[PDB]
Each structure stands twice: as structure tokens, then as C-alpha cells.
């Protein structure tokens, strides 16, 4: 690293570091009720991953959040009957999709990172391939989605912040252009196959994390006095409405569920 200017209280520094970016994915999978043959959704969602890779004379504690943008809405409709398998909507990423990966590590450069300019960085290229996801039907066969794969290539880098129930981290966002790779995908036990992209079924595919190495450089505005600290940990209590709305539902449910647990019992008089 280098120094660029110094006024008593404050300082201007250019941090230049080489990093190892390990990130992961996340997906919400909602099954629909009734018989159990219909699936509601398979969307993507922010995916936090914090690791501790061995560097030089120090073990680098980094944190990432892997987000997705502009994903595509696919679907499968194997019939209008209670028995016809269906996936109302599942997200898949293609060339028109972008992958955002926010990176933050416990080092000196993020120390009091708040104001940055002259920011750029060289990056790798990596290929994330989909695994297997089986749709366990009650009585019958189990159609499994499999395949999917695309490579990501750095487009740009920017300032962002990662919010967890535990911490808030101003970090770097590494935009990504997606390239449809080979391993194409299909659903088994179904009349669909041959089509590219990465579906949100099992994007991680057993792998503990996808990795990308690279380096950057930025000029952050940090105090001359590097014996300071910025509040980093969180304590969140947001969306009380939902908490409530949900708990209220838990109620009506339980009620009805039990409205039965007393109708599915009153009749043990025979």
C-alpha cells in the first residue's frame, strides 16, 4: 500500500491487495399444498459466505454475499390435474443475467472504508455448474432436475454493503457477465430436456463454495489515526409487521389444524 496525503486528523490511502473470493448461492424452494405433485417456486436469494483462508503471516477473514440479477423465469406444466407434476416458476440464469458478489475481509484496507475513489481490479473467470434436485412425489416416480452451467467473467467492481443479522459490511461488489457453458439440463420423468443456463435448483451442487482469485486497488478516505474502529456488528429487529402477520397466521392455522385434532378425535367414539 501507499500514502497519498496527510492532514493531522485524516489521511488518504491507496490500498492494493490480492484476494481469494469464495462465495455460495441460496434458493427458496416452496412446495405447493394439496396432493403434493405441484411445486410453487424456486427463486434465488442473497447468499452469505464467510471463510478463513490462509494467506501470508496472517489468516484472512473474508465475507461475501452472492446475489443475482435479471434472472429468467422458466416453468413446467405437466397437466392441470392433482396428479400432473408442475413447477409453476423456477429461476434460471443466462447471458442476460448478472451475478453480484460483495466482498469484505478483516484487513487493514476495509478498516475504515467509507469513502473510495480510483477503484478498479483485475479478476478471474470461473464456471459454476448445477447438481441434482429430486422432486419427491408421494406415490410414484421422482423427476429430477439436473445439469446447468455458466461461466462468470468480471464486468465491473463497485461499492456495496452486506447486511446480515449479525453484521453490516461496506465492501466491494464484483459485477459479472454470464456465459452459457456446456453441461445442459433436463428434468427426468418429464418431456423437457436440452436447454442452457443455471437453474436455482442446486446451483451449489455439493461444492462448498465457488472460488475466484484476483487483485484490486482503491484510494479510501481513512483517518491518519489508524487506531479507530467503525461499528461493524448488527442487532436487527426489522419488519415487526411480518413477524406479527406470520405469528397471527400460525394462530389461525394451529386453530384449524386443531379444529380437526378435535374432529379427528371426537370420532373415536364407536
Amino acid at each position: 500500500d501507499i500514502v497519498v496525503s496527510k492532514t493531522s486528523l485524516w489521511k488518504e490511502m491507496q490500498y492494493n491487495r490480492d484476494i481469494t473470493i469464495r462465495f455460495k448461492f441460496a434458493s427458496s424452494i416452496v412446495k405447493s399444498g394439496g396432493l403434493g405433485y405441484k411445486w410453487s417456486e424456486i427463486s434465488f436469494k442473497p447468499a452469505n459466505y464467510q471463510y478463513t483462508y490462509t494467506r501470508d503471516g496472517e489468516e484472512v477473514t473474508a465475507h461475501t454475499t452472492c446475489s443475482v440479477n435479471g434472472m429468467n423465469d422458466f416453468n413446467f406444466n405437466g397437466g392441470s390435474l392433482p396428479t400432473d407434476f408442475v413447477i409453476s416458476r423456477y429461476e434460471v440464469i443466462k447471458e442476460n443475467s448478472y451475478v453480484y458478489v460483495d466482498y469484505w475481509d478483516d484487513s487493514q484496507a476495509f478498516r475504515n472504508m467509507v469513502y473510495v475513489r480510483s477503484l478498479a481490479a483485475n479478476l478471474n473467470s470461473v464456471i459454476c455448474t448445477g447438481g441434482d434436485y429430486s422432486f419427491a412425489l408421494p406415490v410414484g416416480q421422482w423427476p429430477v432436475m439436473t445439469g446447468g452451467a455458466v461461466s462468470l467473467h468480471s464486468a465491473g467492481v463497485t461499492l456495496s454493503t452486506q447486511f446480515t443479522d449479525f453484521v453490516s459490511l461496506n465492501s466491494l461488489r464484483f459485477r459479472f457477465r454470464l456465459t452459457v457453458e456446456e453441461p445442459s439440463f433436463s428434468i427426468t420423468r418429464t418431456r423437457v430436456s436440452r436447454l442452457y443456463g443455471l437453474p436455482a435448483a442446486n446451483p451449489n451442487n455439493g461444492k462448498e463454495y465457488y472460488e475466484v482469485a484476483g487483485r484490486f486497488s482503491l484510494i479510501s478516505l481513512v483517518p491518519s489515526n489508524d487506531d479507530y474502529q467503525t461499528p461493524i456488528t448488527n442487532s436487527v429487529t426489522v419488519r415487526q409487521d411480518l413477524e406479527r402477520q406470520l405469528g397471527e397466521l400460525r394462530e389461525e392455522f394451529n386453530a384449524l389444524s386443531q379444529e380437526i385434532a378435535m374432529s379427528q378425535l371426537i370420532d373415536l367414539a364407536l
Copy 2:
């Protein structure tokens, strides 16, 4: 204007004219049972980001419209499974306040973190409620309609907007309400003219309510305007809920699946 230039910093007073576009948001939860009972109609923070053409070029502003001190009304047309009901719905009056946080992509919000000497002149606008039909099993649907109030600037302060996508330090425009004429009512129901704005269809087809004005503040902002502040978010909060919900989704599905059988198998006569 440069009130003060310094080494690395710049005490600056930004004075801009802005067009504020905002929206409303409401949670509507119907109650279980026959489907005649409506549980609640509350307000909720409402995000809206527009791109307006300023007399120089275009700008990108974002807003979050919140409500405070709303009044809880209700309607109880009977204790029977067939008597229409609305356990609770929110309606704003003179005693209610509307908060509207504003942020735009311009130079002034660039590194906004510390501000003093903040004030501004603003317009006045009238939001009128639309129509919300209460769907029913039998009979023509009772429709809530009407409602209307004007907002007049009370003050302005420092706030931060929080979306799943972004966190924005911006300005909060407090509002005093003035109960305006269009009184609201519920078709096919004992509730005739009442003044205010119920959270049924606050927007009323309109894509956004608008207000123009200008402001004057002083933002302790560094100098080299090449600098910015982390603006985009990535939220993973309330893991407990996510879990609690999913868990419920389970017990539900379980029972759901467990009944429709003893129902599509009672269909054997």
C-alpha cells in the same frame, strides 16, 4: 456553493429544486373460515424510484412513503360466519402524519453523512382513495370507496431508506394532514360518509402522487468529488422468521395433504 473548502474536505451548501414522486403500500389479510371475515388493512412503507428530467438533464430519485399515527377503524356486521367483517383497517386523519424520504442520484447526496443548516419550501398535494371491492361467497360485493386528505409540509429531517437492494441516507419530509372533502364509504354497508384516507386503495389507480419544492442544506462532504459511499445492500436479516415461516409451511402442507385425501376419498359414493 463552497461555504468552505479545505485540505481533503469541503463544507458545502447544496441548494436544489426537486420533484417528489411517491407511493403508498398496504397489507391486506383476509381471515380464514367461510371467507367473509377480513382480518386487517394496515399501511406499510412504500418504495418508489423515478427518473425525472431536471432543467439541466435527467435525475434518478427514490422515495419511501411511511405513515405514522393512523386511526384504527373497523366494521362488524354480525357475529355469524356469514356476516361481513373488517376486524381492523387503518385510516389517516389530521392527527396522522405522512413521512416521505427522498433521495436522488445527484451531486448533493453523493457523500451525504453530516448535514446542518437544513430547511426547505414545499408544495401541498391531495391524495384521494380509490375503490376496493370485498370479494364474497354470496351477494353483491361491498365496496369501500372514497377517502381524501391534503398534505402540507411540517418539516424536513435526516433519514435512511432500507430496501433489499439499497440503503440511502436521504431527507424525510414530515406532513400535516388536512381532512379533504371526498369522504369515503362502503357500498352496500351501514358506513356512509367518513373523512380521511383508508388504507384500502390509497393510490387509487394513480401511478404516484407528486410534489415539487426546493431545499437548502450544508453537507460535510470531502472534496475530490470522485468519491462515493457504499450504497447498495445485500440483506439476510430475520433468519428466525424465514425459519418460523418455512416450519409452518411444513405443518400446513402436512395437514393439507393429509386432509384433501380424506376428502377426495370421501368422494367415493
Copy 3:
């Protein structure tokens, strides 16, 4: 009171030394399981916000706290595998291996533009939180009641943190805590479990409006000298749209089915 340490043209490095009265509360999620209504699912702790107004020798103060808990112990009770046997699949209780985090913020001069701080430490009290009573009212039969429980907290450390509410975000101080299993035994009547100390998340508050602790601190906040500069403090949150939706959707399927029953009673 307050000492001005250093100072350039726009900033100023100050050391704030204040004495405070910390009043905080607890909070717990209690989920009963479905069915006959004999099975209890969970009793966890959760962040608890509490804001008060106490007079500091000279004036009227406005503080806000958030009481969080870490490393709690998972107990449970299984009095049978039948729809009629009482059960608490999982309830949290705190012991010596548990810590209590209490974030503190007040409307005073010292938190004004608090964002950068060093040379931070403080002396603090010691207080004892005791559990009250929580009854497991059953369809039929004497409601087994959980009662007792108690531990004392002693200051371990203090650090920087941010409190989050649907209303506000406040950079404030986190006061870590070491626990001591105090006198009060917690015990569930009508049942095998009895004679254990510790604090279970049933009724941690125990009617008390708040637990209190007094103390003072020392720090050095990097702030500007023109003290009319405010930091955005109020929130407006719209996070977790996914859940909102997921919930609502469930609300849907439920109502639907719920209706089919009441129509099964037509």
C-alpha cells in the same frame, strides 16, 4: 464532563465521559405446536428493544437499548409420545456459559455524530434477573407451570455496535456480560423437571418493567467541531420481501383449506 482533545479547522477529536443508567428488557418467541394442543414447539430468546426517559443530574435524558443473548442452552421436556403427553420440544435457558449483550444509546451530545471511537472503556454495576411464572394452560388438566430461574450479570466488556429497529438505527455501546447462576430454582410443576438454576426464556422479565444497571464510561469520538451536523438516525425498512410474500402465500393456501372445512360444516 467532556474534554476536547485535539482540533483542526473542521473536525475535532473529543473524549466523552458520561455516567449512565441502563434500563433494558427481554423478549421471547413462544410457538405452541398444533393438534390437541398438548405439545409446545419452542421458547427462544430474541432481541428486545427498550427506550426510556430518565433524569440525569441536571436534565431529561432519552436512551434506547437492545438486550440480546448469546450461547444459550437448549433444554427440553418429553413427558410422553402421545397426543396427550405434555411436551416442550425445546426451550432456551441461560447459564454461566451464556452471555448477555445490551446495546445502549442516548440522545445526548456524546452519541451525536458517533461514528469513529477509540480509547473506550467503562466501569459497570452488577444486577440479578429472575424469572417469573409461565403457565402451560392445557385443553384439560392442571396447567403445569414453569417458575423460578435467576442469574446475575457482571460486566465483561464494552464495544461498538448498531441497534436496528423498524424505526431507527443507532450506533451505540454494547455491554458484554458474564453470567452467574443465582439462587432462584426454576421448576415445572406436574413434572419430572425441578431443581435447576438458570434463566429460561419463559417469563424472563417476570412482571418487572425493566432491569436496570448504572455505570459510567470513557471514549474518544471523531466528530466535527460545528456541532449542528446530524447523522441520519431514523429508519424506514422494507427488507425481506421474500418472507412477506412467502407468508402471504401461505396465508392463502390456509384460508382456502380452512374454508373447505367450514363448508364441510354446511
